[PDB]
Amino acid sequence: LQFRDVAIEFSLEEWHCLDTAQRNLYRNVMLENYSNLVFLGI
Amino acid sequence: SELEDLKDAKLQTLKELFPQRSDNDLLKLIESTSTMDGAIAAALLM
Amino acid sequence: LSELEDLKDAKLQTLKELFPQRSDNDLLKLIESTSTMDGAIAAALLM
Amino acid sequence: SSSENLYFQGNIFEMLRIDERLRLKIYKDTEGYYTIGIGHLLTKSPSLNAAKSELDKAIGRNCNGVITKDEAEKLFNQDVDAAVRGILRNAKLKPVYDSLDAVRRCALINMVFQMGETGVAGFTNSLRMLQQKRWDEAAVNLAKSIWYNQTPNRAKRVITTFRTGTWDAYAAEALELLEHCGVCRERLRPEREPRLLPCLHSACSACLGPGTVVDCPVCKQQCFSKDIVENYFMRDSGSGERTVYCNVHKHEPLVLFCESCDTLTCRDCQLNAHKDHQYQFLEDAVRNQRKLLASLVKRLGDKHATLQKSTKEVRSSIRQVSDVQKRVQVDVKMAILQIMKELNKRGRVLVNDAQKVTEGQQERLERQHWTMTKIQKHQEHILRFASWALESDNNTALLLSKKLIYFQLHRALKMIVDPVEPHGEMKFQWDLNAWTKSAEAFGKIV
Amino acid sequence: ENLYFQGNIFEMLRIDERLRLKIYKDTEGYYTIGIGHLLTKSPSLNAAKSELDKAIGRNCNGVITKDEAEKLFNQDVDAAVRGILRNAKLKPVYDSLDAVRRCALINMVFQMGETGVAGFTNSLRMLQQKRWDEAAVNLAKSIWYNQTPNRAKRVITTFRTGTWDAYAAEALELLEHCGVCRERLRPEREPRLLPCLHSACSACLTVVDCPVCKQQCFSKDIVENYFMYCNVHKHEPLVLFCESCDTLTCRDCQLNAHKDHQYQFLEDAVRNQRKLLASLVKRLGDKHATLQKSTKEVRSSIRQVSDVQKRVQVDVKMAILQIMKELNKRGRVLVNDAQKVTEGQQERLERQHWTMTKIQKHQEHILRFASWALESDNNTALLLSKKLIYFQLHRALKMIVDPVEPHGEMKFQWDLNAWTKSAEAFGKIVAER
Ligand SMILES: [Zn+2]
Ligand SMILES: [Zn+2]
Ligand SMILES: [Zn+2]
Ligand SMILES: [Zn+2]
Ligand SMILES: [Zn+2]
Ligand SMILES: [Zn+2]
Ligand SMILES: [Zn+2]
Ligand SMILES: [Zn+2]
């Protein structure tokens, strides 16, 4: 179970469809998914 | 002639779109479809 | 008999070792206000 | 639009078809390179056979020097697609392309198609001017180039397109081309025996193949050869208007217009072959014939204007469905990220629930370990000392200090250590399968 | 024989590094404070003070507290361990070593830095291969050993054996040294023994607190550490035990000051006290043996409680990643479903654009030709061309162009409140006794 399985990426076309809150929500989760994986090791 | 003139209009439209199909094949597509767009889509398939 | 005075002494000496710069007066009060040795030690740790 | 008699299907493919005549046989261009089809280069080294080999390779067929038009069209679309990608991946061309309207984008693609993305990137001062508009200025700077001197007729058309943003230079060439063979582009002088096909494309008689039927070289529409007529407008281009004579009564000129048969006739045919149907003399008939035709043109131009609007509507619908797709992709990804957030929030809660238990037990066990350790240190200090004092031969010192030692030995022996108390355990529990099936069946897509 | 120690890295380093609360220069002239904590190699005392202030978080004119020293000590001990683990040459060795020998390696790194210790290439290799006696001999030739030989010998013995005997032996040795300055307690130091069996130079001391323990005694209870003769008569030995007064006395004091109280001869008091003390010591040693085992149990319980907490954190985090994986599996499907619809709609729209474009090309071809024909002055050519032009004009006017259909929009649909409530109720932590 490596990161790709839980990673989400936005294309440039999609990125410009995101408002401020949406770009931050994305940060919250992606930063936190990373921390959980660092702890777990996979 | 009420609808015969429409059938001919559809035929001439297809002939312009598909220049090397016989009038009989193009008429058969018109008969088997309900719209101009339909006949064209079927013609593109052939 | 005076069993509790020997026990009190044993508890006091245990606390004096663990809390070397507390007065015997403070250490006896927390012994008397608690039930077990661990109880008294836990009380002493709150200063 | 600007339709004196100016019409143009304004896009890159139609633009290039005018700039590049179709050649179905390998030919040498004006720099000596072997090319084929619609502006397609086979080889730069002047090889006899590299050109034939690259032709066979590009097509996938044994092409002695010949391809089919379909093959030419396949190469052409590939080559246009290639020119466009070359712009997009190029750091200097891409930002300019993006800034341009569709007409001017085609003018830029035209240059790339002709010269390559590296050559076009070289026109740095002109590219800058265009990104800033300065259309008249870019036009002037581009006319100072080698490109212009080598191919001024094309450069003038491309430059006019950059300058005006219109298609007039191409509408004008499309008009000029009515007077040139649809196949070889030779001007249709009478020496070429120009012929007009029923689809109003015309060609040198020599440029037509096989009563019998002929396939139009331009547009492929088929007709009977008996229906092909002289292109009389061009037939007379080398002299001025000529009396035409009857195909049968070969000494009689055509002087009447038969309205019932909608064609010119000589006196003998109108009197005999065409007896009892309607006519006027040529100069009388022509005024009404010009009015009927001009009126149909007005009607067709109106229909054309409607179709142009209809086509623009379709392009907008295309951009819309594309944007709905992007909306859905974003909505889906944000929906999942939103759920991920709540899952991580619950994760933190579950851990804090476990941590609440653990901190309680650990505070206790750590307190006891601290007690046991500090009591043990005392015990080892007293045992270490008492043994040392006894290892000593100094009996005087031993007795003088026996009081202090004895006290600490008894004191350590009274020390109270409550025993190690046990601990509960905890385990995380959840339904993998119920959650997997709520995923998998999450949502839709209406 | 009587070897006791409390074998861990912290007690190991406390034996080796005397606590200093004021900035001092070590043997290389470097500025140090606390328990072996290097402030700087810079020759500037102010640089040392700046580094001290930086480390503590306050303005220390070169002085810290014991609590502050302890904090640096724990940071530095942790730092030594990280240095070992991040170093390609030290980690394989450390990993291969037992807990006691690991403390020896940490001791060295604490003292010298990870690269200094990594420099001992062959000795490290020997240790990983468990060639203990060879490693000892080789390490004993080093600059380290020549610079701090007693420490190096203790560390090396710890590597040779798997034990703490070297440190138990130093703790015994230290009874003969001052509890605070660690100078040997010769008579010139006026060595004094406190009731808690700690000793100190009188210089380092009604009531007094022990420098080592923080515990109080009456100064009247403090005696000369006599292990390192009469206090009344300048030429007399103490030879009698004044049993009446529980103190040793000389001939003249027993004859006068204590005339005929009660007494035993020293030889009588000696044998008896040594039998009594010896038995109290055996009893204490047995109580100690019991406490050692009960402590091993509390440690095991502490590790177990910690391991349970880690287990739950892992189970929760993995449970969530697994669900996340399934949500993205579904996300990909949801998008692909949408894309099929979009491709269908775009297939239609492009077909319709292709049709309109191609019909337009015809319209422009006819409009252009007919107009050109009419600009011409050649009335004969025009009339000859009329049948063909007219025909195409009417044919173009008849052509059918279906209008664009409204094609409705698709939307992504899901239940946000349902999923937030499922997540809020996700999982359970189950306790058992
Ligand atoms: Zn044609
Ligand atoms: Zn020709
Ligand atoms: Zn007639
Ligand atoms: Zn005739
Ligand atoms: Zn001292
Ligand atoms: Zn002490
Ligand atoms: Zn005396
Ligand atoms: Zn006496």
PDB file of C-alpha atoms in Angstrom, chain A residues 25-26 28-30 32-33 36, chain D residues 333-351 428 435 442, chain E residues 316 319-321 323-324 327 414-427:
ATOM      1  CA  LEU A  25      -8.780  21.195   1.954  1.00  0.00           C
ATOM      2  CA  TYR A  26      -6.566  19.348  -0.520  1.00  0.00           C
ATOM      3  CA  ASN A  28      -5.001  19.227   4.769  1.00  0.00           C
ATOM      4  CA  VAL A  29      -5.553  15.699   3.486  1.00  0.00           C
ATOM      5  CA  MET A  30      -2.444  15.283   1.357  1.00  0.00           C
ATOM      6  CA  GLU A  32      -1.931  14.282   6.655  1.00  0.00           C
ATOM      7  CA  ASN A  33      -1.954  11.203   4.435  1.00  0.00           C
ATOM      8  CA  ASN A  36       0.342   8.717   8.433  1.00  0.00           C
TER       9      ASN A  36
ATOM     10  CA  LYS D 333     -11.886  14.440  -6.393  1.00  0.00           C
ATOM     11  CA  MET D 334     -13.107  17.060  -3.919  1.00  0.00           C
ATOM     12  CA  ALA D 335     -15.838  14.707  -2.668  1.00  0.00           C
ATOM     13  CA  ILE D 336     -13.207  12.072  -1.916  1.00  0.00           C
ATOM     14  CA  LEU D 337     -10.831  14.541  -0.297  1.00  0.00           C
ATOM     15  CA  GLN D 338     -13.708  15.756   1.862  1.00  0.00           C
ATOM     16  CA  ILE D 339     -14.350  12.197   2.999  1.00  0.00           C
ATOM     17  CA  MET D 340     -10.641  11.625   3.567  1.00  0.00           C
ATOM     18  CA  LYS D 341     -10.653  14.652   5.872  1.00  0.00           C
ATOM     19  CA  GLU D 342     -13.435  13.237   8.028  1.00  0.00           C
ATOM     20  CA  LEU D 343     -11.708   9.858   8.110  1.00  0.00           C
ATOM     21  CA  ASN D 344      -8.479  11.445   9.312  1.00  0.00           C
ATOM     22  CA  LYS D 345     -10.473  13.396  11.931  1.00  0.00           C
ATOM     23  CA  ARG D 346     -11.946  10.138  13.231  1.00  0.00           C
ATOM     24  CA  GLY D 347      -8.500   8.577  13.097  1.00  0.00           C
ATOM     25  CA  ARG D 348      -7.193  11.261  15.434  1.00  0.00           C
ATOM     26  CA  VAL D 349     -10.141  10.723  17.789  1.00  0.00           C
ATOM     27  CA  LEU D 350      -9.636   6.986  17.984  1.00  0.00           C
ATOM     28  CA  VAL D 351      -5.983   7.490  18.772  1.00  0.00           C
ATOM     29  CA  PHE D 428      -8.886  -1.632  17.183  1.00  0.00           C
ATOM     30  CA  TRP D 435     -16.592   0.002   4.253  1.00  0.00           C
ATOM     31  CA  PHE D 442     -20.126   5.557  -3.381  1.00  0.00           C
TER      32      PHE D 442
ATOM     33  CA  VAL E 316      -6.336   2.793  12.801  1.00  0.00           C
ATOM     34  CA  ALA E 319      -7.687   0.869   8.280  1.00  0.00           C
ATOM     35  CA  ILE E 320      -8.102   4.406   6.986  1.00  0.00           C
ATOM     36  CA  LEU E 321      -5.528   4.072   4.211  1.00  0.00           C
ATOM     37  CA  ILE E 323     -10.612   2.691   2.853  1.00  0.00           C
ATOM     38  CA  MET E 324      -8.936   5.616   1.081  1.00  0.00           C
ATOM     39  CA  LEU E 327     -12.443   5.466  -2.471  1.00  0.00           C
ATOM     40  CA  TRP E 414     -23.171  11.759  -3.451  1.00  0.00           C
ATOM     41  CA  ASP E 415     -24.438  12.030   0.111  1.00  0.00           C
ATOM     42  CA  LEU E 416     -22.097  14.248   2.143  1.00  0.00           C
ATOM     43  CA  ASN E 417     -24.013  14.106   5.414  1.00  0.00           C
ATOM     44  CA  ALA E 418     -24.339  10.329   5.241  1.00  0.00           C
ATOM     45  CA  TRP E 419     -20.575   9.946   4.795  1.00  0.00           C
ATOM     46  CA  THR E 420     -19.677  12.413   7.528  1.00  0.00           C
ATOM     47  CA  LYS E 421     -21.846  10.462   9.974  1.00  0.00           C
ATOM     48  CA  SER E 422     -20.332   7.138   8.900  1.00  0.00           C
ATOM     49  CA  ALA E 423     -16.823   8.510   9.394  1.00  0.00           C
ATOM     50  CA  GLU E 424     -17.703  10.017  12.791  1.00  0.00           C
ATOM     51  CA  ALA E 425     -18.837   6.532  13.851  1.00  0.00           C
ATOM     52  CA  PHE E 426     -15.959   4.710  12.152  1.00  0.00           C
ATOM     53  CA  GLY E 427     -14.201   1.968  14.075  1.00  0.00           C
TER      54      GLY E 427
END
